[PDB]
Write a sequence for this structure.
DNA sequence: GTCGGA
């Protein structure tokens, strides 16, 4: 997962997590309005610190000083809990990135066709993220990654990997600072939303170019 | 110390 839509108001997403969570984030009624959220930008990220929830703009990408290559944007759930690189993020930098759905590109030959993937029941998604804390320091190299998992069922037909999406109840547990890395691994294993809860459709190729914006990017298209 | 298009 390297592109998604986060277009609604923050209250719209937070209300699915809990009554209290929505009250605990300062009021900002503006729809986030982003139909083409791309790595290397700052993205509103939900987390907990000092027993309080926070929604901060955080760089999507992770590139510590000692990392000579371009920023990572994903971390594999298979190994992130024990990775030399991601272990500290799994333990102390868990977060949630909400979204309306995400884009995946199917490589039908030498070209790519984008699909928008969303919950069949019309709810937004909560993607599991890990990152560098303190998140609020506006670091532009040490941000967050979206945790990935193996594509299951029909998603396998689009791409071999997928974001780890948590149910709202799991998303709330994921963010708790007092839990073990092992508890987090069990939340990730127990709270993942399987492919049969999603629908998807092809969308215009225009989304691939980050310059393109607007609700059209997620509309279904005929020709593929 | 690892994994999107353009």
């Amino acid at each position: 997962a390297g592109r998604f839509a986060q277009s609604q108001t923050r209250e719209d997403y937070l209300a699915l997590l809990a009554e209290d969570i929505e009250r605990d984030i300062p009021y900002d009624p503006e729809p986030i309005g982003r139909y083409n959220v791309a790595p290397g930008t700052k993205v509103l990220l939900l987390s907990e610190r000092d027993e309080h929830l926070h929604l901060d703009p955080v760089f999507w990408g992770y590139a510590p000083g000692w990392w000579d290559k371009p920023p990572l944007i994903n971390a594999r759930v298979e190994t992130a809990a024990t990775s030399r690189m991601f272990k500290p993020l799994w333990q102390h930098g868990r977060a949630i990135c909400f979204a309306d759905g995400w884009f995946e590109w199917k490589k039908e030959g030498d070209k790519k066709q984008p699909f928008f993937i969303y919950r069949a029941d019309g709810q937004p998604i909560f993607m599991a993220a890990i990152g560098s804390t303190p998140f609020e320091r506006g670091d532009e190299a040490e941000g967050f990654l979206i945790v990935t998992a193996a594509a299951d069922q029909g998603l396998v037909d689009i791409h071999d990997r997928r974001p780890l999406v948590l149910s709202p109840e799991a998303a709330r547990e994921w963010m708790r600072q007092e839990i073990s890395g092992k508890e987090a691994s069990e939340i990730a294993a127990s709270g993942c939303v399987p492919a049969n809860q999603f629908s998807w459709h092809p969308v215009s190729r225009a989304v691939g170019n980050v310059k393109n914006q607007g609700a059209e990017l997620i509309q279904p298209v005929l020709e593929v």
User: Anything to note?
Assistant: The longest helix of chain A spans residues 181-190. Residues 1-4, 38-39, 64, 66-67, 69, 72-76, 79, 83-87, 103-105, 112, 114, 145, 148, 161, 205, 207-210 of chain A lie near DNA strand B (CB under 10 Å from a C1'). The CA atoms of residues 7 and 34 of chain A lie 5 Å apart.
